[PDB]
Design a protein around this ligand. Structure first.
Ligand SMILES: CNc1cnn(C)c(=O)c1Cl
Length: 101
């Protein structure tokens, strides 16, 4: 692993700790979220992020942070503000960026 891959793995582990239920661990399926794929143009999740770190797809911390923000923004677009997914996405978006400094 390169220094960036080691850093991003550290950030990913710390971000996933903030989602103990694993709501963001895997891609959102159309079975759980009817018509999700039709509403959300660029889906993102922690699992996909791990696959991109392993494949060395992230060339900067800026790119990784963009994917994390995407994941949270998607949940805040699809879900209504009163839901657990929306509330967690908003919470981890701010906490995650703070953590990453
Ligand atoms: C499993 N997590 C889920 C399920 N449904 N929806 C709509 C979501 O946004 C998330 Cl993060």
């Amino acid at each position: 692993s390169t220094p960036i891959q080691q850093l991003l793995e550290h950030f990913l582990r710390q971000l996933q700790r903030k989602d103990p239920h694993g709501f963001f661990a895997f891609p959102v399926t159309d079975a759980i979220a009817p018509g999700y794929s039709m509403i959300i143009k660029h889906p993102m999740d922690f699992g996909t992020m791990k696959d991109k770190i392993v494949a060395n797809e992230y060339k900067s911390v800026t790119e990784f942070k963009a994917d994390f923000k995407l994941m949270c923004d998607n949940a805040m677009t699809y879900n209504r503000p009163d839901t657990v997914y929306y509330k967690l996405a908003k919470k981890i978006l701010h906490a995650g960026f703070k953590m990453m400094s």
